[PDB]
Structures are given as structure tokens and as C-alpha cells.
Amino acid sequence: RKLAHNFYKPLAIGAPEPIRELPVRPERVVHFFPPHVEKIRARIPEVAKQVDVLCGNLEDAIPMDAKEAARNGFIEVVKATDFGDTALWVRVNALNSPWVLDDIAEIVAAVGNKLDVIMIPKVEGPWDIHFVDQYLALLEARHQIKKPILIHALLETAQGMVNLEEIAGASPRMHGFSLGPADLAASRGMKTTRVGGGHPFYGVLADPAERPFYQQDLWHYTIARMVDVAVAHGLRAFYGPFGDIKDEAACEAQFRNAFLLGCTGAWSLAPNQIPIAKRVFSPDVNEVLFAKRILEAMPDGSGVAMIDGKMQDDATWKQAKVIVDLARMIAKKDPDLAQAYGL
Amino acid sequence: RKLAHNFYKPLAIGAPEPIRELPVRPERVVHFFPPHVEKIRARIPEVAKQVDVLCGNLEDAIPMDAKEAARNGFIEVVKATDFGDTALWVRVNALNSPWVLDDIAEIVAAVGNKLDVIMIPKVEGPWDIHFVDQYLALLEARHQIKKPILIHALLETAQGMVNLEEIAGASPRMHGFSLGPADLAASRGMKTTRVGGGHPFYGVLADPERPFYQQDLWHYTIARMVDVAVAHGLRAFYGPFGDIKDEAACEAQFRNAFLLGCTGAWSLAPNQIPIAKRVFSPDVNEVLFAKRILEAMPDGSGVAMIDGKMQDDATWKQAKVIVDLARMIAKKDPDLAQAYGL
Amino acid sequence: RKLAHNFYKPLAIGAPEPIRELPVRPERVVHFFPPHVEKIRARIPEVAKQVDVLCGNLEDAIPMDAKEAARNGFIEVVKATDFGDTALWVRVNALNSPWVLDDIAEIVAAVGNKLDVIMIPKVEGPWDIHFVDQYLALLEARHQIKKPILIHALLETAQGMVNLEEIAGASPRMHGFSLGPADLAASRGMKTTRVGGGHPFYGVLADPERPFYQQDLWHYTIARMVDVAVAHGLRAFYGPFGDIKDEAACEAQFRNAFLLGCTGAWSLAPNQIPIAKRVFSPDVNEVLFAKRILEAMPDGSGVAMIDGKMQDDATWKQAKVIVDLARMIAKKDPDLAQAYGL
Amino acid sequence: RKLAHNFYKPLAIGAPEPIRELPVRPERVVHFFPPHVEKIRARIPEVAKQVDVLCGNLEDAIPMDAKEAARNGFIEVVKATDFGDTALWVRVNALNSPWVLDDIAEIVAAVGNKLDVIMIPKVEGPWDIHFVDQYLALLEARHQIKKPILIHALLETAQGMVNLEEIAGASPRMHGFSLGPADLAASRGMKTTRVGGGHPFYGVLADPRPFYQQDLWHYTIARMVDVAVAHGLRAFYGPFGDIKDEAACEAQFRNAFLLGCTGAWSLAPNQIPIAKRVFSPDVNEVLFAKRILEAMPDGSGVAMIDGKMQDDATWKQAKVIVDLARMIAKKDPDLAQAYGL
Amino acid sequence: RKLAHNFYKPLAIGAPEPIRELPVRPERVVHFFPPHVEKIRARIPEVAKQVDVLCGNLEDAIPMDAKEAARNGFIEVVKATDFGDTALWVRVNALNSPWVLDDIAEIVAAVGNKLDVIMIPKVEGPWDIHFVDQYLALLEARHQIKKPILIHALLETAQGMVNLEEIAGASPRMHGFSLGPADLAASRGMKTTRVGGGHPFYGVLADPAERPFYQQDLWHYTIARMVDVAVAHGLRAFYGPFGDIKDEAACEAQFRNAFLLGCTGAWSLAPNQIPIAKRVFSPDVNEVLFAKRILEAMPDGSGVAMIDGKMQDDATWKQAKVIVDLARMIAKKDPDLAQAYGL
């Protein structure tokens, strides 16, 4: 628990000033891609135009022999690509791995000024954050990175869920969390199906034709807790990978459940999940219109105002301010939503 | 959190001795009324006889040009009304609002001896409780209030849910928590259809037509609220249900709270009044069992075993609570009086 | 918490060295038996062969006038029986009862080397663990117990759930947790139709006859229990299911706990024995995947990758546990032996 | 720490109700004695009249073959002695020792209604207190002890000094702390020439040479007092080993007293009057407190004495120091007139 | 402790923005005066010209029948006086007294825009700070106070010393601490012969004519602990009152002991203590001359510099900046120190 007057200081001389609040931009879909596959690298400038954020993958589904080819491939394609409004993330290897050191160092050195958020696997405590925060700062100051590279934590273990508060407030670099269904289920010892997301035998048997069996959601406690901790710290919650690429119905349903609980976006591991994520995690229409009324009653966000019998202040205003700014950005690339939002 | 030998001490010279445990009384329904409306104000003495708890509202749905009127209005009825066995609460404005200072100060000064619980909107940390505690204490001393005015925390933000333990044990004034569904959903970013309800699209899709089983949005919230509240000797409450017209959903939602361990719920309309009282009335067989406990242990001392279960002091005090509670309800409900035998 | 270098030191001179990790063995079923009953006592050596864990009961459903005969009767049967591969547990009385002192002391004194785990009722805080840990150490050093006796915490209060993390990391004696549904629901104010069951009136009403989707009362509880236990290297157990004859609902409830990460459940009758064993037997596909991890990394060192997932120390020793557990079960079950390939 | 509404409840059924405040009584001197020595046991009924607190010792300086004799001898003399106004303490063996179980269990069983305070050696954390608290409660309930036996923590390790706040607020049984100089110095690696004393070579050298000796125990005692007082506990100076050096003994006792310590141990009859003389309540403080008790008849309302507002916390301490002075006045005629009680 | 992103927010709509760093100004002497006394009240414009800080007293040594007179007297003299460079404090009554509410409310209402710091007696925990913080914010918003009024905690109990960390980080209003010797000694059970002084009989007796008796300082632990907690949280530590007015020798020695341990200033209960405090707690000439070179080496305050073998960063530059500003302000009032400092 750092002191407030030390929390927002750069951890290295020449490192960029830590952020006071998260950058507002579309993050409905976190599209993953293997940077070592040449065919994939070829289409990256085209796919970048269809997604909110594009994320390079050096960890899972990346063979041990391809680790360096992935890192170099990532650096290669990023140097050549103008991502424009699409954000750039990268998931490096775990902190105990023999690749993570070169992963962060070589990438920040080469394409640090294009990198927005870095994803760290298997974050189990604030000590993990402390290392990465200090490590990035020294790398940022070294190569004159102009904007602080944010930290996205991947929740994969039982300990991670327990230490969620301490992780959330360990650094001003914190961006948010991603629920890793397959990894977390393996850690906890959950028996799920279809690489994480449910099990048809988890339900309630009714009292006595045949007794009704009402399936229940295995991930209620997990997401609910993830949202509360994240929101309280001004961070965003995300549903991670939905491994069952072919079941688009279960995918959209699972994505929707996350959205209804307060999640910002989800991962896509294939071209068919891109439109699903962008559709589900798009800001509610009525919610956008309501926030426009709030911004109109309060030009500065100063003073006291009441809308629909509800007192307004700086908190509700900044909040209305982010969702309108967000919706406007989405409207800029979606004529159909530009009409529905009036933005 | 304060030291044990300082926790139950008055925060002001003249302030009444803090309570050691919650006053036992019916709290199945907390009826909200707008004190600035003379028409509604005039019916208060008769409504009070219909509800367990009556709560004046100065906050939401009370216009900014009517705050002073709502405040002065509330003082007016309370001065002129004898509430009898009905508890008197009031929901003042937010701690950052330009109304809260005069709200608490003037109401305590005028009717502090009739006010039981004050409800604080948007409690997010123990620092909120600490302010209200010290502020009330100085006010109680100035006007010689005989009973300590308790504090009810309204949960409306994510931080409030996370800091629930710190809030619960921040003061001996703590009464309990009310879930503010609409406000909490807005804070978290929950997508919900109507206040107090859930969402039709939250559910589990069955494996490869595929059935769709709706889920409860508020399960985690109520469960955590109950656990924290009970552990600190407080009481958990379900807040407002915005759909007055839909009584079936209202009873179903109130029942979900009751089954998880909530004490009562809010009522915004007269049709919600009998619903809350019916749902949150103490379980009959549970009451009947506590009567055996109180009898096996008249003094409440020594060791006793009922149905193979050992009875210590903790279970006895719990049994004393529900039996007394059931009796105060049986006092004005001939049917429950029959079932309880009280 | 204690410092790391002190955490694994014995609390008494002559007390066995504290374990660094849980002893791996079948714990799918915890069969309870009243040691004061003679006809039950006689059939014990036979019942022991049919269960993974046999637990003597001195607490609930044991009359106060039979407490001593239960304690003595337990010592008698344990003395004359070689339980073999069956784990031996005992549930003593509550830490505030007038029996617990003689319970722990006399049992450890006589059969301490045959006792594996002691179940403590109503653990509410780390202080409870601290007493038993220090108490046991003094008793172990006195009678030269070679194996450290582990503590199994019974969760029966809301405060216990709130302090679950402090309880989990209070001692290396910690084995795991078991839910006490009848008590935990009483403490919370939860309404259940069965001990360890749910409630048919708890569910989501659909928007406009309106269908009613039942929900699980225990989702929050089990989920929190699992995360805390697993994080501290402990095992979470479901506990008892009241409705003995509802084997259908018994299996479903046991299954839900298993799917969430619970190691096993209690059995209150012979018919619940095969149900618990069937349900909590290690998932076939976890066993298979674990063997691939072990086959890939002989000594557990170095870096490897299975199905795209990097394997480290944590994954390896976790896989070592599963296979060892599956092998111990394969030994006494030919069907699972072929399914596991062990 | 436990929750406030649970903190003051008996930890066993039939156990006496936990105290809310420390019992007010003279504790200027804690006189130790070896209960196994029959010659000492014979004079105890008379020695008790000469000390504020009498504490039997089962731990240090008690041979391993005499541990059982000491425990039985203690029970024997306590049964035979009417202690009157003299407090009865006992220092059992360490919590890891093979004697502590029998020490606490058998003594409480036989003379639990005469035992006021147990001194526990080498208390390092709240866990130590949690065990003793729960263990005592079950023993108290079983033998129907009428008053809760308090716990006095011995500070003998660096860890104990670090976990002071956590040890203090871990139980309502907590009476206070005694400093254990020899063992604490050994734990820290501190160099002292005497048990309870400092070191002549610890000091400040002047600039170009006089050498100004410093007190090694300043930090330790100051920290102990703050933590104890904050929790409503009493801090004590432990044993002073150098029996013959009465000048240095009084100086060490006085240093502790000036910092806020309640009393000190006595390892020999000659230290008994020294502790009394030093740790007797200041006359001026007693007289000023009498003014408070007179100005505020019930302790309510708001008064002001010498330009200082008197609430309830100030009045409660005025009441404590006066009651304490009166009890001492009951057996010291010189202070009876000095205090005016 | 609050989260960093909520820590620096107004606690009320209309309340001024909380400070990020302590205002830099001469605080060597905090001169106490009784506002209920007429002749004192009439010389205030003259005395204020001779002190760094002027603090009105409503608490100790103020009779109960004079509480209202003192409160009104303070308000009247502040309204009529332009204090210029002199800071204005006030010590209201204890938080449990029947005078606190009126003390704070009426003063903020009438002279809130002239009040710099408010001193609270007997601060024992963060909860105390929490009340005053919120109370002030609601009063500041109501009366349009432009600058936030800071909180100065008086240490008078053993509990206060123990909870010193939680107190220091309880609010951005925190200015620092003052040691209250008579009250704290009474709480602890200490014995002193003078208010603020030690005790002759507290010392080390040398080994075996006469055995020498080396006197020891009673307040070493207290001041040392107070300084570490204060400095860590970016606060300032003050000695407080030295009750022995006559003994100027002991007063200066006692003030110096605080100054050598890092205390910013002390109270002056009498006109003869004013020049003593100003002389003692004036910034050391060596620190000013050296800290200037730091600013000289690195003007903007960034980059990597090295002075006398020691690396200079943001932390050291910021501390060097304040010591020169402080010295320059003092230079404006003292031509001797203006010569020594060179400012």
C-alpha cells in the first residue's frame, strides 16, 4: 500500500508520468494473434481495422521453439503497421518463464511507443505487479517511452482471486483483469466443459413426470467479485478466452452474461468471434442517451444538479463523460451505432 | 477499527451511552414517504399503524427546490405524531450534498428523541461512518437525546461492497445495510431491467432447441451482504423495488432476500406494504424451535442439548431475539399469534 | 500471521515436525459413526474397508449423558482395529463445551499415533486454530506422537466465512474445511427445506403463467470456500446432506460441490457411501492430463509444454498429487483402475 | 483482533465473565519465591503481608527435577495462606515446555480462586495469548473459578517487542507486560553487564574527551509503556539482578517509574522497600486528582481545573489513582498523611 | 486508508480542491494568544508582524464562561487584521466538548478565507481526522472557501502515539503534528518537573567517591518516532509548548533538541520565546547553500545530476526546492539570514 503522494510518481528518472485515470477507448474485443505465423502477419493491417484492440500472443499455443520467432515477428509487424485507432496489446510469457525477460525488454525497446497495454499471465499477488511496474519504468526511461505502458492482469489461480484487492491497487499502471476460464478451473479444481465456461451437470434438482433440473452458472461468484474489485479501483473487467470456437451460441451467451455483470469486453481467438464481441459489449443505447442528458445539465461537472430525482456530482458526471466519449468513438467506426447513439 | 475498551464509549460529553446490541423490534417493512407532500403527510398517523418501520425521504425523488420543505415537513409530522410501536427512520441527503448538514442537525434538534435510525446514502468506507458518528454524538449531547440514533448504510457503489467489513465494524451505531439495486447496478455497470429486478438475458445456455435457464444477478451481492452483516451483529435489508405494478415479481424478489437471511425490505407504495410483511415474517417452525431453547435454558446458563445439538450462550441470545421478535409481530397479527403461540 | 521461518516449527519440545503439505490419500467420503453404540462399534472393522475416511462423532446427535461413553468407546474401537488404508478422523465437541478438554487430551493420549485428523466444530477465527495447534503440540510431545495431528475446521457461522482466510493460514496443521449446512443456515438466517439442500421458493421469476427458475443457495459459500482453501493448499469438503432417502438430490448436491472443486462429502448412512465415492472420484480427464505432465517432466524441473500450456513446478507437483490419488483409488477399484490406467 | 461484541465473552460455558477494566490494587512490587524450597514456604504466610504482589516461580532458577515439587509446593502454601490484600501471581513454564500443561491445569484446579494473575514466559504473538485464554476459560469453567485469571506477558524476544500491539489487544485477560532484560538482551544480541542493567561503554564521546553514558533501555520501555497504556494495560520493569547494588537498583526502578511503569520485580528482601518507595503514586498527582473527584461528584458534565477540561477519561484516571493511593494508605501511615486518605 | 484516486477529491460539492503538497512558508514559531483578552487582541496587528505563525487559543487556559467570548474575540480580530505573510491558526476545543461545533462552524463561516490551519486537541485515531475532514468540507462548500483549511493534530495520548501512522495518512488536509508534553505525560504516566522539560532523576548511574549521574532525555523516543511518521507522509513535526517561561536557557536547549531531530518549529507561550524559536528553527546555512547547488545543477528538476558524489533525482530536487523557497521567504524578514543564505 504505497502512500498517495508517492503512488503517481514515475519509478525511474526519465520514465513517463503515471496516469491518473484509464484512457477512454473502445475495448469491446481483444483479438489475439500468433505473431510468428507469416500468413497471420500479412493480414494484420486489415484485421486491425475490424477490431477495437489487437493483442499479440507469446504465451499459450506458442511452441517453445517459436518463442523467439513470435517475439521478433511481433516487433516486425508492429514496426510496419499503423494501427490508427486500434489499440495494441501483447501477452508475454509468465514471470517464472525463461522468455519473459527478453519479451518485455526487446519489445519495449523496439516498439514501446506503439504499445498501449501489456498482459501478464498468472498474476497471483501485488509482488508480481511491483516487479513489472519497476521493470517497465526502467525500460521506459531507457528508450524514452512517452506514455506509460499499462498492466493487464490475467486471473488464472485461486490465489489471484483472493489477492484481487492488493493486485488492483498495487500500481497506477493497472488497466484491469481478464478471467481465464480454463486456467482458473484447473487451479480451483473445477470440472467444466468446452475449455471453460460451464458444465451441464451443475444445477438444482427440483422436488418430486421427472424432476426438473435447472442448470446454474459456475462463474457467477468469480465475475461478480472481479467486477466489484475492478470498478472500485477504477479498473475494467474482461472475460478472457472462450475456447469453444465453433459454438457461437454459447459464446455470445457467455459474453452477454459478462456484459450484464459489468464486464467491458472479451477476447476473440478467431475471426468469427470478432463480430460477436463487438456486438455484445457495445454500450446500451438508453444508457448513452441518459448520459447525454447528464452532460447537458452540467457543462463543467461542477455545481449540483438533479436528473430524474437523482442528485448528480463529480462521480456521476465523469462516468457519464466516459460512456459518451466511448460511444462517440464507436460511432465513428459504426454508422449504425452512430445513428442509434445520436453521436 | 477502534480498541474494544473505547468502542462503546460516548463520542461527546452528554451523548447517550452507545448500544451494545441491536434493539429487537419488527423490521419486515421500511415504508418510504415524501414529507413535503401535505396529502401524503396527513395520512401518516394511520399508515404508521400499518408498517413496522416508517422512513422519511429527503434524498431521491425529492426535488432540489423542495429539500427545505421536505426537511421541515418531516419535522412537522413527527412532532405531531405518536408512532407507538412503529420505528421512525429518515434518509438524509448525500454526505457531499449541500443539504446534509442542516438535514441531520435540524432533525436531531427538533425530533431527535423520536428518531431511531438515520439512513446514509452512498456509504463507501468507514470514514463516512466516523463522520456521522462524531457529528451525531455532538448533536445528541447538545439536545440531551436519551437514545443513541443508529446508522443504516445504503450500499450503492462497488467500493461500498468491497469495504463492507470496514463499514460494518466502524461504530456501535451501525444498524445494518440496505441494497440499493438501481444505484449499485449503475456503479458496477450491471445491465438490469427496472429497479430491484434482474435481467432476462442473464442465464445458462444448455448444450446442443437448446434450453435457457435464467440466473439471479444479485446472488453474490445479497450473500456477501448477509455474511458481513450477521458476523458484526447487524441486519441486512433489501432496498427499493421500482416496479410497483408488478407485485408477483416483488414478492418473488423479496422472498429471495428473505431466504438468504435478509430482515426486511423497502416499500415505496401501499400495495407493497402487505407483501413485505408477509414475506419477511419469521419462520414458524424456527420460532417454535427457539421456544424450546428458551425453555431448556431459562436463565440461559449452563449447557443444554436439543435434538442432538448443544446449546451455548450464542444460540440462546439468538433464540431470545426471534421469540421476542415474533411476539411483537404476534401482538398485532392474530394469525401469526396463533401459529407462534405468543 | 506468524513469520515464515517460524510457521513450520513445532510448538512443543518433542512434538512432531509440522507437515509442509497435505498427505495425499482418498478422502472422497467421510463416514460418521457414534462410538458409544456397541452394535455399531462391532461392525467398524468391516465398515472401515468400505470407506476412505472413517470419522468418530462426539459432538452432534451424541447425548450429554453419553459423551463420556462416546469418548471411551472411540478409544476402545480404534485400539483394537487396524484401519489399514482408511483414514481416521474424530469430531470432538465445541471449544467452549465441558467435554472438549477430555476429548482431545484422552484421545491423543491413547490413540494419537492412529489419529490422522481432528474435526473442530464451529471454528470462527484464527484464535480457535491457535489454541488447538498449541494444545495438540503439548499433547503430542507428551505421548511421543510421531505424526502431527491435522486440524479440520467446521464452518457453521457467518463469522467463520468472513474470517475464512485468517483461519486457513493460522497453522500448518490445517487440513481443510467442511460446511455445516444446518448451523451455517441458522447463523445466517437462511431458509432450507433440507439439511444441505436448497429451497424450492428461491429462484428467478420470468417476465410476463410465468416460469420459475430455481437457483442455488450455496453457490457463493462453496465458491468462496474453494478459492480460500485451494489458495492455502487446503481441501474443501461439502459436509452432510440431511435427506437420507433422497439419493437423487443427494447425488446432485454432492455433484455440484464436486464440480466447484470440493474433495469430498460426509455420509450419514450406508447408502450415502457409494454415492460420495462415485461422485468425488477424480475426473478421468484430469488424471490423464496429469500423467502426460509427469511423463513429460521426470524430475519436475526444467521447462516443458503440454497442449500449448507451459509446465512449471506448481503444475508438476499438482499433477503428482492427482496421479498418486488416482493410483490409491485404482488399487481398490478395478473399474477406475482401467479408466485411469493405473 | 476479535470483534467488539465478542471480545468480552467467556470462552467456555461456566467460565467467569471477562473483566472490562483492570482491578485497581497496589502493584508496586512483584516479589518472587521458589515454592519448592520448604524453608521459603514456611515464611510465606508472613512475607505476604510485606509485599503488594507475591509471585510463585516455576520457571527460571527452578531445576528440572524440581519442577513438580515447585508446582505442588505452590499449591500447598497457597492453600494454607490467607493472603488478605496481597495479590497472588504465578510464573509457569514456557508454552513449549513439558511442564506448562500440568502447571496451569493443576494449579487452577486446586487454588484457582486464589490466583489473580498468571505470568507467561516468552510471549511472542497473539497466538500465545489465544491459547492461554482459551485454555484458562475451559479450566475456569470446569473448576467454577469465580473471577477471570488475568494474563501477564513476559517480553523476552525481539519478535515480542515487534508484536506488542498485537499481543496487547488479543484478550480481555491481558493484565500487562514485564520486561525480561537478560533474555531480551540475549535475543537482540544486546550487551549488558548486569541483569536489568545497561553498559558503561554505551555512550557519547565528546568532540576533541568526556564520555557521556546513555540508557540502553530507553526505546524498549518507552515503546512498552505506549502500547500498554493505549490498551489500558500496565507496564512493568522486570528483575534487577545486581542484588547488592541498591543505589543502581533504585536508579533503574526510578527510570522505569518516570517513564510510566507501574512496578518492578524483587529478587531479594532488600529490594522490597526500594520498589515500594519508587513506585508509590506521586503525592501531587494524588492531590490534584482529589480536586477532580470533588469538582465532579458523579464524573458527569463538564468541569475545568487549572485551565484544563475534565471529561470522563480524565475523571476515570483521577478515580483510579485516588483509589490506588487509599489502598496503599491503608498500610502506610506516612503516605496516608501525605495523600490525605 | 482511502484509495489514491479518491484521496485528493473534495468531500463536498463546492469544497475547494485538496492540496497535493504542503504550502511552503516560515513556521519556526507558532505564537499562541487568548482572543478573549482585550489588551492582547488590540496588539495583534503588531505581534503578527513579529511571528511566522499566529495561533488563537480556545481550548486550554480558556475559562468555560469565556468560551463564547474567545470565539467571538477571535472572529473579530481576524476580520479587522490583514495578516500579510503571517499564517493564521486556531486551536478549537476537544472533539467531545460542547464547544467544537460552534468553534469550527462560526469561524469558517466568518473568517474561513483567512484561516490556514486548524489545530485539533487530543487526536487519537484516523476516525477523528475523518470527522474534521468531512465537516470542514461541508462548511467550506457552504461558505465558498477558496483554499482548503489544513488539519494539525495534537498528540496528547498514548493511543495517539501508537496510531500515528493511521492518523498521518487519514486525509490530504494533514499538516503535521504538535507534541503536547503535559497531556501526553499524564496519559502515559510519565513524570516531568516542567511542561515540556524532562526529569532530573531520569538518568544512568555510573559503576562504583560519588558515582556520576548522567541525565537522559525523556522525549527522545517520542520526537524521533513523531519525525519519521511525519516526514514519511510528507508532513511536518513541531515540538509544542515549553511551559517554563522564565528559564530561557532550558527552553532554547529543548527547542534545539527538537530542531536537531528534524522538527519544523515550536510554540511560543510568551513574548520571550518568540526570538528563541525563530533563532533555533531557522534553516541551517549549510543546507541552504547546498540545496541551491542542486537547483542550480538541474533547473527544471528532471534528468540525472550528481552533487558531491550523490545522485540527484525528483525526490531530492523537490526537497531542495522547498528549503530555498523557505530560506528566501525568511530572507525577506531577516537581512542577516538573507546574507547567510544569499537569497
Residue numbers in the entry:
A (entry chain D), E (entry chain C): 2 to 209, 214 to 348
B (entry chain E), C (entry chain F): 2 to 209, 215 to 348
D (entry chain B): 2 to 209, 216 to 348
Question: What's written in the study?
Answer:
Malyl-CoA lyases are promiscuous enzymes that accept a variety of substrates and can catalyze the reversible aldol condensation of CoA thioesters like acetyl-CoA or propionyl-CoA with 2-oxoacids like glyoxylate or pyruvate.
Subsequently it was discovered that in C. aurantiacus an MCL (MCLC) catalyzes three different steps in the 3-hydroxypropionate bi-cycle for autotrophic CO2 fixation. In the absence of substrates recombinant MCLC crystallized in the orthorhombic space group P 2 21 21 with one hexamer per asymmetric unit (AU). The crystals diffracted to a resolution of 2.5 Å and the structure was solved using the molecular replacement method. As with other members of the CitE-like superfamily and malate synthases, the core of the MCLC monomer constitutes a β8/α8 TIM-barrel. In both MCLC structures (with and without bound substrates) additional electron density was observed at the 3-fold rotation axis in each trimer and was modeled as Tris molecules.
